[PDB]
């Protein structure tokens, strides 16, 4: 029995994305954030292509396809970054990209140190919880369906169905090698707790990037086209409470 679903997730997983950062220059707030913004712009393209290739995604109304990506990109990218940090440098640093690795000094220089420490904590959890590559893939996919508008999507029912199916796939991945129903429940508890922990981080980053865009001209930080549009149009819907994450607990 070939695992079709996981086969697909592995196949569509985005390759390496570089930020284009000049590491030969002394670190500066403006340069680091401008590079993170460009990295975001570059990653957004890969996330869109990735999402459109996910099982069942095309079934969502096109407007909803765009909206869910516009609302979930921060969480998705932060989660993938934590995994890269864990696998590449054992969480010793934040591995945003091969050419953009943050040690504590850079975390401080970026003016979002607390957020960076929380992301480092997220990265360590992949190790502490012994998250498998297959669990990572399924969890990352679920993150794309974890934040919706209070007013509902154009075809909310299709979204609910898709989300349920991805949760079911996570159940299957958990059940693999687990004959004890209690061990499966305990694992599901751990993974949903981890998924929930991504949201508070994403929200703090949403707040930070929103404030930065508003004063970007004052601090010499450049925002690429898509990033500027999304942070000025969709992100505010999240910050104002019109779009909310779907938490498993609490």
């Amino acid at each position: 029995c070939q695992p079709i679903f996981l086969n697909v997730l592995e196949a569509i997983e985005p390759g390496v994305v570089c930020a284009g950062h000049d590491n030969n220059q002394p670190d500066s707030f403006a340069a680091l954030l401008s590079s993170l913004n460009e990295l975001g712009e570059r990653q957004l393209v890969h996330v869109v292509k990735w999402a459109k290739a996910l099982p069942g995604f095309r079934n969502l109304h096109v407007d909803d396809q765009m909206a869910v990506i516009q609302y979930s990109w921060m969480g998705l990218m932060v989660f993938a970054m934590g995994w890269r940090s864990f696998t590449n440098v054992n969480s010793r640093m934040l591995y945003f990209a091969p050419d953009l690795v943050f040690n504590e000094y850079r975390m401080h220089k970026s003016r979002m140190y607390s957020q960076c420490v929380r992301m480092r904590h997220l990265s360590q959890e992949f190790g502490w919880l012994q998250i498998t590559p297959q669990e990572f893939l399924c969890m990352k996919a679920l993150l794309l369906f974890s934040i919706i508008p209070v007013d509902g999507l154009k075809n909310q029912k299709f979204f609910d169905e898709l989300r349920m199916n991805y949760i079911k796939e996570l159940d299957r991945i958990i059940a693999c090698k687990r004959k004890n129903p209690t061990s499966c429940s305990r694992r599901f508890y751990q993974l949903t707790k981890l998924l929930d922990s991504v949201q508070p981080i994403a929200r703090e980053l949403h707040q930070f990037t929103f404030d930065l865009l508003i004063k970007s001209h004052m601090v010499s930080v450049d925002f690429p086209e898509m990033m500027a549009e999304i942070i000025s149009v969709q992100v505010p819907k999240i910050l104002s409470g019109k779009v909310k994450p779907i938490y498993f607990h609490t």
């Binding site: 957004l44 396809q65 765009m66 086209e225 549009e229």
Partner: peptide, 8 residues
Amino acid sequence: SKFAALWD
């Protein structure tokens, strides 16, 4: 927009 164009 540039983002929306990813669907064209």
